[PDB]
Amino acid sequence: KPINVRVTTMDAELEFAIQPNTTGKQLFDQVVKTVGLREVWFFGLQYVDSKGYSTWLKLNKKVTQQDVKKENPLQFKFRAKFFPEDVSEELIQEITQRLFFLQVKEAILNDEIYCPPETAVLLASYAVQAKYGDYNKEIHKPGYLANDRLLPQRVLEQHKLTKEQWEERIQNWHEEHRGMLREDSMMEYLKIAQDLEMYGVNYFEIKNKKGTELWLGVDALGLNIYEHDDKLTPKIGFPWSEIRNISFNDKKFVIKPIDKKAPDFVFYAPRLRINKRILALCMGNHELYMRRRK
Amino acid sequence: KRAPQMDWNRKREIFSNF
Numbered sequence: 001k002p003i004n005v006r007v008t009t010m011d012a013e014l015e016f017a018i019q020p021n022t023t024g025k026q027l028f029d030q031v032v033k034t035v036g037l038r039e040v041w042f043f044g045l046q047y048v049d050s051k052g053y054s055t056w057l058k059l060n061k062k063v064t065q066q067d068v069k070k071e072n073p074l075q076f077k078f079r080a081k082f083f084p085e086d087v088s089e090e091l092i093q094e095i096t097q098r099l100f101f102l103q104v105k106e107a108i109l110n111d112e113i114y115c116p117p118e119t120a121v122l123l124a125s126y127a128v129q130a131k132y133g134d135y136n137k138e139i140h141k142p143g144y145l146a147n148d149r150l151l152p153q154r155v156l157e158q159h160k161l162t163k164e165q166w167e168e169r170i171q172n173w174h175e176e177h178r179g180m181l182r183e184d185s186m187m188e189y190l191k192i193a194q195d196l197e198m199y200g201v202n203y204f205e206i207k208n209k210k211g212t213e214l215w216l217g218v219d220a221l222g223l224n225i226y227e228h229d230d231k232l233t234p235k236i237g238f239p240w241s242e243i244r245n246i247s248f249n250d251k252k253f254v255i256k257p258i259d260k261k262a263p264d265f266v267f268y269a270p271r272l273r274i275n276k277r278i279l280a281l282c283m284g285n286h287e288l289y290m291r292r293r294k
Numbered sequence: 295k296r297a298p299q300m301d302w303n304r305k306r307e308i309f310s311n312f
Contacts, residue, residue, distance in 0.1 A: 197295045212312045224297055225309065236305050237297025262302040267309070 003064070004073035007031055007045065010102035015073070024059035024066070031078050039096050041288065042084070046077035053273060056081060056280070079103060082284050083200035085220045085292065087190045094183060101130075101186040104193045109152055113198045114232060117155045121166070123189055124150040125173030130185035135175045145170060197232040202281055206253075207268040216267065218281040220289065223255070238265070240289040246282045248275050 002017040005027065014034055018027060024045060032040050045057040048069045057076070058066060068074050080103055084090035091097045105127060107113040108120070115123065127150065132140065145167045156166070177185070193199055201217040201224070208214065215226035222239035226232075244256040248269070255265040269275055300308075 208312055209310050210312070214309075214312060227312070232295065234295060234297035236300075236308055238305070257302055259302065263306055265302065265306055265309070 005076065006073045007076040007078050009035060009078045010099055010106070018063055018074075020062070020064050022063050024057045024061060024063055027063055027076070028057070028059055035078070035099075036093075036095055037099075038093055039091070042080050042082045042096075043078060043099075044081040046079050048075065055273075056277065081281075082288060083194075083220055087187065087194055091187075091190070097183065097186050097190070101190055104190065104199070108193070109149055111152050111154050113193070113196055115152060115155075115196055117151075117158065119192065119196075120151055120155045121169050122173055123192060124170045125177060126185050126189040126192075128170060128174045129177040129180050130182050130189070132174070133182075134178055135171075140171070140174075143167070202278075203231060204269060204274060204278055209266075214267075216269075216278070218278065218285060220285055222285075222289075223282070240286050243286065246279065246286075248279060251275075253278070 001019060003019070005016040005018050007014045007016065007027075009031075012035075014031065016027070016030060028040075028043075028045055031037075031045070032043075037043070044059075047055055047057055047066075049055050049067045050069055052069075055066075057063070063074075078099075080100060083100075087097075087100065091100060104113070105123075108115050108123060128145065128148070129135075131148075132144075143164065146163075150170055151166055159166075161169075180188070201219040203226075204216045204218070206214050206216045206225075213228045215228060215231055217224040217226060217231075217234070222237060222241075222243070224234040224238070225236040227235060238255065242257055242259075244258050244260075246253070246255050248254070250272075251268055251270060253267050253269060253275075255267075257263075257265070269278065
């Protein structure tokens, strides 16, 4: 009474104040009012608890009842928790497109989403077009990208190419985007991004009966299972349309099919905190899958 | 990239095999 609050979107900082009574939903609704967002289903608020773990904020609960890291002001991240099946059909608003664009790019650059070198360079050139506008000989002299985080660290490491050489490659691509608007630029970035194998999938360390470490990916299209050393190749898939119920108890997940004659799929996951999030992503992705088909 | 199409018994089988 009153508690200071800071929420960052990918491009802005917002300062608010809340009461001990304030629910997540209200703080969340404030953000979307300030940001002018209409496709709210994709997004959520993100915080650090007293332990130090990143957590999604529960909306139907009070904010001061969720053990947010005690500090002045309280820190939040407005971010996408769910991803569209296709960006062209589902990102109608400008701001929406912008927010997705900046988040995905950050994922690329921080090496959260795997991206090969040639595709990375083409992604960079769109982020350049979006930021610098039309290429211009007089303005964009050799070296104008020296102060830009353009390529992922993986790509810079995996070559014998120098700094300015990568920059020459991006420039060459930039020149060719000579007609493109900022809106179009961000979308082309996203259209290429969305087809990277690691795009829009949450990864979770899981186990089989033998205790073999594996990966479980939750995405828009359903669930996937990966080799522990290959996050790019799905080995077993469960499309949402084939699932009936997902639940967990302690450390064990049960997935029941629609078939009803088919057997339950079982796997294991270590921490309870992660399990809550796994559950939440499943329900949310399943919901949006169905809504797109009603 | 789309996981190889298969039935549920096969899924449990392969998963246990890893």
